[PDB]
Design a protein around this ligand. Sequence first.
Ligand SMILES: [Zn+2]
Length: 45
Amino acid sequence: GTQGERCAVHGERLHLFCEKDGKALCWVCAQSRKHRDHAMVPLEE
Ligand SMILES: [Zn+2]
């Protein structure tokens, strides 16, 4: 019932939406050498 989906890997609040993956990441995961940056917009809600 945890109101607020945090990035559990690091232990921080997340704001990023992979449109390509259809998943909610953080800025740090946008900066990740893993995740191919293209269809990803930050959570501007
Ligand atoms: Zn992250």
